Design an enzyme around this catalytic site. Structure first.
Site, PDB file in Angstrom:
ATOM      1  N   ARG A  50       0.831  -1.197   0.000  1.00 22.78           N
ATOM      2  CA  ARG A  50       0.000   0.000   0.000  1.00 22.78           C
ATOM      3  C   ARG A  50       0.869   1.252   0.000  1.00 22.78           C
ATOM      4  N   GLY A  51       0.364   2.322  -0.605  1.00 21.83           N
ATOM      5  CA  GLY A  51       1.095   3.574  -0.675  1.00 21.83           C
ATOM      6  C   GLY A  51       0.196   4.783  -0.500  1.00 21.83           C
TER       7      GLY A  51
ATOM      8  N   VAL B 293       0.132  -1.029  -4.908  1.00 26.87           N
ATOM      9  CA  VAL B 293       1.067  -1.840  -5.681  1.00 26.87           C
ATOM     10  C   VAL B 293       0.628  -3.299  -5.788  1.00 26.87           C
ATOM     11  CG1 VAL B 293       3.455  -2.559  -5.949  1.00 26.87           C
ATOM     12  CG2 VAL B 293       2.934  -0.341  -4.922  1.00 26.87           C
TER      13      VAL B 293
ATOM     14  N   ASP C 118      13.543  11.094  -2.615  1.00 22.25           N
ATOM     15  CA  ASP C 118      12.841  10.249  -1.658  1.00 22.25           C
ATOM     16  C   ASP C 118      13.605   8.962  -1.427  1.00 22.25           C
ATOM     17  OD1 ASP C 118      10.907   9.711   0.215  1.00 22.25           O
ATOM     18  OD2 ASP C 118       9.423   8.936  -1.211  1.00 22.25           O
TER      19      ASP C 118
END
Length: 326
Positions: free
Chosen positions: A43-44, A49, A149
């Site tokens: 999860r994002g 994904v 990031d």
């Protein structure tokens, strides 16, 4: 005078405008029916994904279903992925489809989570994987792009194949000398001092701070190394290690002023030597060369940090460089 990158300063100046003007990108979509979701992988914040398959070939892929997102931001990630496609240890964008909204298709990598992997990593594994990561960083920097990031979660490692891929370019940007960027990038624990003191004319070197944070966490077995409870506390956590004298000099150099509420929190602190983080459990991962390398990454002054190329040349990677030649 505005700050500028020590390296790769002019790469986007000599490129055609089409290379960095992502906002004008005409996306050539495939069709969603070509790819199929098999199992959810993670999860994002911006996307979900999935481990998936190319139906018309039974080829396995990673499918990233981008959640709500602006046209400008989607094109930025797609354009950057396309620009970098093929470089060393860069995740490879295979396709872009849409129903609505978008969805990014990548090559598959059988990754082990860093929370399981890092505690088992040997002294040589760390030298090896950091070197692989530096390959990616030197490449994307040489292509005029900062990742912004860098962190364990965005470094996919297949430990049996000993492959490494730098992923999630959703926060990446093109470097333009003299440009003021958003400081709300990267992830809290890996944010460079520049983002915490509102220095907007930063550059590739931001990624090298993030790397240093990752590196410190690995060799000292301390995740995350700088554990701030918010963006202000994040600076405090850094100042309690790097000390505030170096902080003051850095603020002076770039004519920065901390707001009073942040200044009260930062207070005054002596430098804590890197050796103070050595203990019985991590001592096998720490050496004079590892500490020297880390110390040259974790500097307040972004201009004073090693570049990716300089980092690869460091004595800490001597064996890895020699072992790579063959």
């Amino acid at each position: 005078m505005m700050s500028k990158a020590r390296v790769y300063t002019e790469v986007n100046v000599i490129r055609p405008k089409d290379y960095w003007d992502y906002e004008s990108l005409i996306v050539q979509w495939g069709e969603q029916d070509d790819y199929e979701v098999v199992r959810k992988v993670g999860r994002g914040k911006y996307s979900e994904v999935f481990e998936g398959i190319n139906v018309n070939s039974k080829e396995k892929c990673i499918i990233k279903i981008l959640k709500p997102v602006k046209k400008k931001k989607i094109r930025r990630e797609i354009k950057i992925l396309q620009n970098l496609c093929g470089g060393p240890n860069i995740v490879k964008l295979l396709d872009v489809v849409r129903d609505q909204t978008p969805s990014l298709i990548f090559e598959y990598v059988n990754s082990t989570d860093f929370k399981v992997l890092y505690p088992t990593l040997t002294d040589y594994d760390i030298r090896y994987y950091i070197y692989e990561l530096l390959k990616a960083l030197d490449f994307c920097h040489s292509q005029g792009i900062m990742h912004r990031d860098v962190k364990p979660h965005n470094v996919m490692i297949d430990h049996e194949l000993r492959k490494l891929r730098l992923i999630d370019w959703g926060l990446a940007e093109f470097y333009h000398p003299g440009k003021e960027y958003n400081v709300r990038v990267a992830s809290r624990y890996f944010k460079g001092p520049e983002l915490l003191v509102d220095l907007q004319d930063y550059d590739y070197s931001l990624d090298m701070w993030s790397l240093g944070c990752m590196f410190a966490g690995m060799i000292f077995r301390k995740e995350p190394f700088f554990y701030g409870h918010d963006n202000q506390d994040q600076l405090v956590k850094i100042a309690k290690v790097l000390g505030t004298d170096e902080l003051n000099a850095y603020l002076n150099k770039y004519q920065l002023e901390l707001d009073p509420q942040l200044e009260a929190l930062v207070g005054r602190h002596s430098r804590k030597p890197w050796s103070k983080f050595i203990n019985a459990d991590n001592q096998h991962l720490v050496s004079p060369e590892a500490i020297d390398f880390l110390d040259k990454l974790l500097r307040y002054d972004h201009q004073d940090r090693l570049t990716a190329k300089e980092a690869m040349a460091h004595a800490y990677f001597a064996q890895v460089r020699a072992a790579e030649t063959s």
